[PDB]
Amino acid sequence: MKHYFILNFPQRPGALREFVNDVLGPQDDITKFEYGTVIIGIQLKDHDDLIQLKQRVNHFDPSNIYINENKMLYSLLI
Amino acid sequence: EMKHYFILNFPQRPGALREFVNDVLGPQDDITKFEYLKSQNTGTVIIGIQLKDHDDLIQLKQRVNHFDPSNIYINENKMLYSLLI
Amino acid sequence: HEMKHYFILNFPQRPGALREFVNDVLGPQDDITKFEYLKKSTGTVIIGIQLKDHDDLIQLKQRVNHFDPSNIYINENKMLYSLLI
Amino acid sequence: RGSHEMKHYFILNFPQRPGALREFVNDVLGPQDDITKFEYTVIIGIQLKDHDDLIQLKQRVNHFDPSNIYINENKMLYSLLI
């Protein structure tokens, strides 16, 4: 239910405003935002919405890295 | 000053970052720094905000005060500005 | 011009653990170039080391292994080196 | 807390020259003084075994970094950073 990513936020201004209002859903909530590599944890109301979120993250940052797929990154970062 | 810096004890209310971006922040305003200084995910964060216009600073401070009543404006303390920025 | 070695260690919470790493684990000719945390609840740290004698690297990894058996040599993993350096 | 506080915190500008941490661990610190914190300008915490040893530690810290800031004096700096 808590899914973690690693992104390189664009230096383009208003990117986080674009991320909150477009990349994420209304019921989705950011649970982590630690440092331009940024670690971010997002909680999902339903697991059936994860795949579409992954696609939107790839549009925002093609350099995105899903943490939960690599166990070592999960143990080290989370 | 077009870049302003604050100290906030981020509320545990869900969607706080969305609340800060859409309500505490202006549509033409951007955040330039988001760095914790405390540790856990529950922590004290140092935030930097850039305003489109300086006239919106007084009203911005009030929005930050409603978000975290114990917030601290750094730009008006030379000691904290020199140490944290 | 120079080569450095970065490690991930679950640094023991015992007091004086850094003196042990500097004196017992690290050779007198070797120096530390990076000490940065990755998480807390203050466990994981990235420690970068510059050795004057590359031939002593094998012995270094042993002393790091005895210090923290959870040692991870960052330089081996491709994804870890690019992400963390 | 005239002689009963054993955890003391400082803000130092570490020289980026080699062996600085070895110089700080051996030359600056005392034999019974143990490090308790080191986070990035770096905030450092040391626990003494004897409060009388504090004077010498502060003197040696001033030599290492004249720009050092003993945090415990400022209750504000103590609250925000610890």
C83 vs A: CB within 8 A: yes
Question: Hey, what are A70's tokens?
Answer: 């690599």
Among the listed residues B1, B16, B3, the one whose alpha carbon sits nearest the alpha carbon of residue B68: B16
CA gap D82, D80 in Å, rounded: 6
CA gap C38, C55 in Å, rounded: 29
- Classify each residue of A42-75 as buried b or exposed e, where b means 16 or more C-beta atoms within 10 Å of its C-beta: bebeeeeeeeebeeebeebbeebbbbeeeeebee
CA gap B18, B25 in Å, rounded: 10
**Which residues 6+ apart lie within 8 Å of D41 measured at CB?**
B83, D11, D12, D13
Whether residue A9 contacts residue A44, with contact meaning beta carbons closer than 8 Å, is answered with: no
What's the structural domain count of chain D?
A: 1
| End-to-end alpha carbon distance in chain B | 14
CA gap D5, A38 in Å, rounded: 38
Minimal Cα–Cα distance from A62 to chain B, Å? 22
Whether residue A53 contacts residue A24, with contact meaning beta carbons closer than 8 Å, is answered with: yes
Assigned domain for D1 exists: no
CA gap A66, D60 in Å, rounded: 47
Assigned domain for D29 exists: yes
CA gap A50, B1 in Å, rounded: 41
Question: Hey, what are C72's tokens?
Answer: 């991870």
Assigned domain for D2 exists: no
Please provide the size of chain C in residues.
85
Assigned domain for D71 exists: yes
Question: Hey, what are B28's tokens?
Answer: 């033409």
Among the listed residues A67, A62, A69, A1, the one whose alpha carbon sits nearest the alpha carbon of residue A34: A67
Task: Give the dihedral of Cα atoms C51, C56, C62, C63; nearest 10 deg.
Answer: -50
Q: In what order do the strands lie in the sheet with D34-39?
A: D34-39, D42-47, D7-12, D69-70
For residue A73, the chain C residue with the least C-alpha distance is C80
Whether residue D4 contacts residue D54, with contact meaning beta carbons closer than 8 Å, is answered with: no
CA gap C21, C32 in Å, rounded: 10
Strand partners, B79: none
Element (H, E) at B19: helix B16-19
Minimal Cα–Cα distance from B17 to chain A, Å? 7
Whether residue A58 contacts residue A64, with contact meaning beta carbons closer than 8 Å, is answered with: yes
Method used for this model? X-ray
Assigned domain for D46 exists: yes
Element (H, E) at D38: strand D34-39
Question: Hey, what are A58's tokens?
Answer: 């790839």
Mark yes or no for CB contact A20/B21 under 8 Å. yes
Minimal Cα–Cα distance from A67 to chain C, Å? 12
CA gap B53, B37 in Å, rounded: 28
Whether residue C35 contacts residue C54, with contact meaning beta carbons closer than 8 Å, is answered with: no
Q: Using only C-alpha atoms, what is the Rg of chain C? A: 12
What distances in angstroms separate CA C13 from CA C10, C17, C23, C42, D39, one per listed residue?
A: 9, 7, 17, 8, 14
What CATH code is carried by the domain that includes residue C49? Answer: 3.30.70.260
For residue B36, the chain A residue with the least C-alpha distance is A34
Q: Which domain holds residue C51?
A: 5-84
Element (H, E) at A39: strand A37-43
Mark yes or no for CB contact C42/B39 under 8 Å. yes
What CATH code is carried by the domain that includes residue A18? Answer: 3.30.70
